[PDB]
Design an enzyme around this catalytic site. Sequence first.
Site, PDB file in Angstrom:
ATOM      1  N   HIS A  44       0.444  -0.895  -0.033  1.00  0.00           N
ATOM      2  CA  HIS A  44       0.190  -0.084  -0.087  1.00  0.00           C
ATOM      3  C   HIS A  44       0.977   0.986  -0.039  1.00  0.00           C
ATOM      4  O   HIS A  44       0.352   2.188  -0.460  1.00  0.00           O
ATOM      5  CB  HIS A  44      -0.819   0.068   1.134  1.00  0.00           C
ATOM      6  CG  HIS A  44      -0.928   0.415   2.519  1.00  0.00           C
ATOM      7  ND1 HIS A  44      -0.578  -0.373   3.566  1.00  0.00           N
ATOM      8  CD2 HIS A  44       0.369   1.521   3.145  1.00  0.00           C
ATOM      9  CE1 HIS A  44       0.324   0.357   4.281  1.00  0.00           C
ATOM     10  NE2 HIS A  44       0.000   1.500   3.937  1.00  0.00           N
ATOM     11  N   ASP A  91      -0.752  -7.031   1.650  1.00  0.00           N
ATOM     12  CA  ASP A  91       0.447  -6.331   2.058  1.00  0.00           C
ATOM     13  C   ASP A  91       1.372  -6.237   1.790  1.00  0.00           C
ATOM     14  O   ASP A  91       2.507  -6.014   2.906  1.00  0.00           O
ATOM     15  CB  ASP A  91      -0.246  -5.475   2.673  1.00  0.00           C
ATOM     16  CG  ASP A  91       0.348  -3.782   2.795  1.00  0.00           C
ATOM     17  OD1 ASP A  91       0.277  -3.206   1.845  1.00  0.00           O
ATOM     18  OD2 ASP A  91      -0.106  -3.060   3.717  1.00  0.00           O
ATOM     19  N   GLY A 192       3.052   6.239   9.131  1.00  0.00           N
ATOM     20  CA  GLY A 192       4.373   6.365   8.816  1.00  0.00           C
ATOM     21  C   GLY A 192       5.814   4.811   9.231  1.00  0.00           C
ATOM     22  O   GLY A 192       5.987   5.413   8.212  1.00  0.00           O
ATOM     23  N   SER A 194       4.456   2.600   8.372  1.00  0.00           N
ATOM     24  CA  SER A 194       3.840   1.126   7.371  1.00  0.00           C
ATOM     25  C   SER A 194       4.801   0.975   6.648  1.00  0.00           C
ATOM     26  O   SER A 194       5.098   1.924   5.787  1.00  0.00           O
ATOM     27  CB  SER A 194       2.550   1.893   6.311  1.00  0.00           C
ATOM     28  OG  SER A 194       1.775   2.306   7.179  1.00  0.00           O
ATOM     29  N   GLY A 195       4.773  -0.834   6.334  1.00  0.00           N
ATOM     30  CA  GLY A 195       6.162  -0.881   5.094  1.00  0.00           C
ATOM     31  C   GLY A 195       7.571  -1.275   6.117  1.00  0.00           C
ATOM     32  O   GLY A 195       8.369  -1.947   5.228  1.00  0.00           O
TER      33      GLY A 195
HETATM   34  N1  LIG Z   1      -1.702   1.084  14.478  1.00  0.00           N
HETATM   35  C1  LIG Z   1      -1.356   0.250  13.780  1.00  0.00           C
HETATM   36  C2  LIG Z   1      -1.272   1.009  12.551  1.00  0.00           C
HETATM   37  C3  LIG Z   1       0.062   0.850  10.939  1.00  0.00           C
HETATM   38  C4  LIG Z   1       0.117   1.817  10.222  1.00  0.00           C
HETATM   39  C5  LIG Z   1      -1.141   2.159   9.928  1.00  0.00           C
HETATM   40  C6  LIG Z   1      -1.794   2.327  10.325  1.00  0.00           C
HETATM   41  C7  LIG Z   1      -3.493   2.937  10.200  1.00  0.00           C
HETATM   42  C8  LIG Z   1      -4.065   2.573   9.195  1.00  0.00           C
HETATM   43  C9  LIG Z   1      -4.817   3.453   8.292  1.00  0.00           C
HETATM   44  N2  LIG Z   1      -6.245   4.120   9.819  1.00  0.00           N
HETATM   45  C10 LIG Z   1      -7.764   3.414   9.692  1.00  0.00           C
HETATM   46  O1  LIG Z   1      -8.163   3.597  10.648  1.00  0.00           O
HETATM   47  C11 LIG Z   1      -7.962   2.589   9.200  1.00  0.00           C
HETATM   48  C12 LIG Z   1      -8.602   1.282   9.763  1.00  0.00           C
HETATM   49  C13 LIG Z   1      -9.551   0.836   8.852  1.00  0.00           C
HETATM   50  C14 LIG Z   1     -10.149   1.045   7.428  1.00  0.00           C
HETATM   51  C15 LIG Z   1      -9.106   1.906   6.491  1.00  0.00           C
HETATM   52  C16 LIG Z   1      -9.755   2.265   5.898  1.00  0.00           C
HETATM   53  C17 LIG Z   1     -11.122   1.484   4.799  1.00  0.00           C
HETATM   54  C18 LIG Z   1     -11.039   1.494   3.092  1.00  0.00           C
HETATM   55  C19 LIG Z   1     -10.801   2.281   2.692  1.00  0.00           C
HETATM   56  C20 LIG Z   1      -8.981   3.041   3.318  1.00  0.00           C
HETATM   57  B1  LIG Z   1      -8.601   2.962   1.867  1.00  0.00           B
HETATM   58  O2  LIG Z   1      -6.998   2.941   2.813  1.00  0.00           O
HETATM   59  O3  LIG Z   1      -8.780   2.389   0.995  1.00  0.00           O
HETATM   60  C21 LIG Z   1      -9.607   2.825  -0.122  1.00  0.00           C
HETATM   61  C22 LIG Z   1      -9.729   3.495  -1.437  1.00  0.00           C
HETATM   62  C23 LIG Z   1      -9.851   4.430  -1.921  1.00  0.00           C
HETATM   63  C24 LIG Z   1     -10.286   5.680  -1.706  1.00  0.00           C
HETATM   64  C25 LIG Z   1     -10.986   7.192  -2.563  1.00  0.00           C
HETATM   65  O4  LIG Z   1      -9.453   6.887  -3.277  1.00  0.00           O
HETATM   66  N3  LIG Z   1     -11.258   7.434  -2.256  1.00  0.00           N
HETATM   67  C26 LIG Z   1     -12.523   6.912  -0.915  1.00  0.00           C
HETATM   68  C27 LIG Z   1     -14.171   6.603  -1.514  1.00  0.00           C
HETATM   69  C28 LIG Z   1     -13.968   7.987  -2.258  1.00  0.00           C
HETATM   70  C29 LIG Z   1     -15.395   7.870  -2.713  1.00  0.00           C
HETATM   71  C30 LIG Z   1     -17.160   7.846  -1.908  1.00  0.00           C
HETATM   72  C31 LIG Z   1     -18.153   7.771  -3.103  1.00  0.00           C
HETATM   73  C32 LIG Z   1     -18.331   7.559  -3.726  1.00  0.00           C
HETATM   74  C33 LIG Z   1     -16.803   7.572  -4.816  1.00  0.00           C
HETATM   75  C34 LIG Z   1     -17.229   7.208  -5.991  1.00  0.00           C
HETATM   76  N4  LIG Z   1     -17.045   8.385  -7.089  1.00  0.00           N
HETATM   77  C35 LIG Z   1     -15.417   7.622  -4.134  1.00  0.00           C
HETATM   78  C36 LIG Z   1     -13.343   8.805  -2.898  1.00  0.00           C
HETATM   79  C37 LIG Z   1     -12.198   8.248  -2.033  1.00  0.00           C
HETATM   80  C38 LIG Z   1      -9.831   5.759   0.020  1.00  0.00           C
HETATM   81  C39 LIG Z   1      -9.762   5.008   0.277  1.00  0.00           C
HETATM   82  O5  LIG Z   1      -9.131   4.980   1.744  1.00  0.00           O
HETATM   83  C40 LIG Z   1      -8.799   2.676   3.991  1.00  0.00           C
HETATM   84  C41 LIG Z   1      -8.792   2.811   7.675  1.00  0.00           C
HETATM   85  C42 LIG Z   1      -5.578   4.878  10.781  1.00  0.00           C
HETATM   86  C43 LIG Z   1      -4.354   4.165  11.287  1.00  0.00           C
HETATM   87  C44 LIG Z   1      -2.584   2.048  12.017  1.00  0.00           C
END
Ligand SMILES: NCc1cccc(C2CCN(C(=O)c3cccc(-c4cccc([B@@-]5(O)Oc6ccc(C(=O)N7CCC(c8cccc(CN)c8)CC7)cc6O5)c4)c3)CC2)c1
Length: 243
Positions: A44, A91, A192, A194-195
């Site tokens: 990711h 991942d 930060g 991650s990876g």
């Molecule tokens: N402590 C250990 C640790 C270690 C490293 C990193 C972390 C972090 C992980 C991420 N975090 C979460 O809390 C978290 C938790 C669960 C799930 C998620 C998450 C869930 C779903 C999706 C995503 B994503 O990473 O996966 C995605 C895929 C696509 C998108 C995107 O492009 N958008 C979201 C959808 C949007 C959208 C809305 C409505 C309609 C459309 C169609 N036009 C499009 C457009 C923008 C955005 C996205 O975000 C993340 C985040 C913060 C902490 C933690």
Amino acid sequence: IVGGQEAPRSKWPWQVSLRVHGPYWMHFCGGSLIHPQWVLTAAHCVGPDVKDLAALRVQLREQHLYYQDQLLPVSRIIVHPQFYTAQIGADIALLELEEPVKVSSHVHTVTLPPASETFPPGMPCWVTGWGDVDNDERLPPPFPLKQVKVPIMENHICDAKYHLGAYTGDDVRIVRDDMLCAGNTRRDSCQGDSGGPLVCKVNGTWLQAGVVSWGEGCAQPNRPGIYTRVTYYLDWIHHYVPK
Ligand SMILES: NCc1cccc(C2CCN(C(=O)c3cccc(-c4cccc([B@@-]5(O)Oc6ccc(C(=O)N7CCC(c8cccc(CN)c8)CC7)cc6O5)c4)c3)CC2)c1
């Protein structure tokens, strides 16, 4: 890194920082040196969409980000083809450097686990990086490499914990078999990190058990950190990285 402390100079000589071109070459993810031309990281960090390689560089072990940067370019980004999101899994990715690096006590590779190692609880494992020190708290300057000892939780405990306070059916698995849990409310990775590597000392050798992958926030109740489980992806790794 949430909790724990600034790492010593002599520890984690495999730790890597990944940098994206912009106003400055900014840290966005960790990595580990697993071979002189190969960094292991999280998919990711570099995907799922194809990036411009020229916008990406690698920095080998540094006690403090940015102060003595000697960036290194990258010739190949290999991302696991099963990968789409961290929550689904796979991942994991590989970076090939344009040149092999030179190895030393300050800077050398980490050993990969044999496929049999399960990394059970009560194993002492440390995770490392330059990521946030809590939810929405940036690592402050001078950006020292941090470490924290994290307790490993068995996958099934951890899946169950992720179901507490959730609508998701208990039978619907969240923490997948290709993943690994560690952390608690004092000790965890964060954005930060991650990876970068989760490493465990076994028969006096450091083995990388995990790659920092995801979690529901950082050091949140019933939400241990989740890592990609290296054992699961050895054959894929070995398809690219010589023994
Ligand atoms: N402590 C250990 C640790 C270690 C490293 C990193 C972390 C972090 C992980 C991420 N975090 C979460 O809390 C978290 C938790 C669960 C799930 C998620 C998450 C869930 C779903 C999706 C995503 B994503 O990473 O996966 C995605 C895929 C696509 C998108 C995107 O492009 N958008 C979201 C959808 C949007 C959208 C809305 C409505 C309609 C459309 C169609 N036009 C499009 C457009 C923008 C955005 C996205 O975000 C993340 C985040 C913060 C902490 C933690």
